[PDB]
Design brief:
Two copies of one chain form a homodimer.
Chain A: E1 3-4, E2 12-21, E3 27-35, E4 42-49, E5 59-64, E6 67-74, E7 83-90, E8 95-97, E9 100-102, H1 103-106, E10 116-118, E11 121-122
Antiparallel strand pairs in A: 2-3, 2-10, 3-4, 5-6, 6-7, 7-8, 7-9, 8-11
Function (chain A): Stimulates salicylic acid signaling in host plant roots.
Main location (chain A): secreted
GO biological process, one term (chain A): effector-mediated perturbation of host innate immune response by symbiont
Chain lengths: 125, 129
């Protein structure tokens, strides 16, 4: 009866992800790859800017390869639990994933390890 | 040595979003979304989620709103043009550290139509403390 929106494809792996913010936290640069395991991986540089707290700001849309990427941060669970969610959409495939990283994971500017993978969903555009 | 890549998909039944609809007021300054969240492990939770704006509440980000065990936010994107507008919810169960992102096109929900069949989504782990 229900319709699963999960696509029958390999999980997309977000590779070598890191966040580096400048001294004033007015710019944060996220760098990562998107490896679908079905095509050449795409390297992404994704810059978010704000007058203050760029680490908390919503970003995009940015186009990287076949992907349209946005992001948003949530402090809904308090500051120890802040986390950023990306929306990574391949319009041509009508597929989307939402990689979500806590501030704890990224705050030192070190690469997140292990790389994390996510099951894409169909977006019936 | 390098740890193997890690799937964030939890080994749980997909959460089904039931009877989803959106009703907006005449001026589109407030939209009320109603739906259930059925995890298949407990009675489904009936939710009411209101998004307000000075204009275009159907395009506005909303939340956080608490509905039972869930914390819900939403955002809208017209990145692909207005015919392809779509809303994405973030539905988190903090206690379980699980999150899903149901996403509905503007076509699906226009005029208060109920989305059918009900759509299900695989939750991801969110490594909160």
């Amino acid at each position: 009866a229900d319709k699963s929106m999960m696509a029958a494809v390999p999980e997309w792996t977000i590779t070598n992800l890191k966040r580096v913010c400048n001294a004033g936290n007015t710019s944060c640069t996220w760098t990562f790859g998107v490896d679908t395991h079905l095509a050449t991986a795409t390297s992404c540089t994704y810059v978010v800017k704000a007058n203050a707290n760029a680490s908390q700001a919503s970003g995009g849309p940015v186009t990287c390869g076949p992907y349209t990427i946005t992001s948003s941060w949530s402090g809904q669970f308090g500051p120890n639990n802040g986390f950023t969610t990306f929306a990574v959409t391949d319009f041509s495939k009508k597929l989307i994933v939402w990689p979500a990283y806590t501030d704890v994971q990224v705050q030192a500017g070190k690469v997140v390890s292990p790389n994390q993978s996510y099951a894409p969903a169909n977006l019936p555009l």
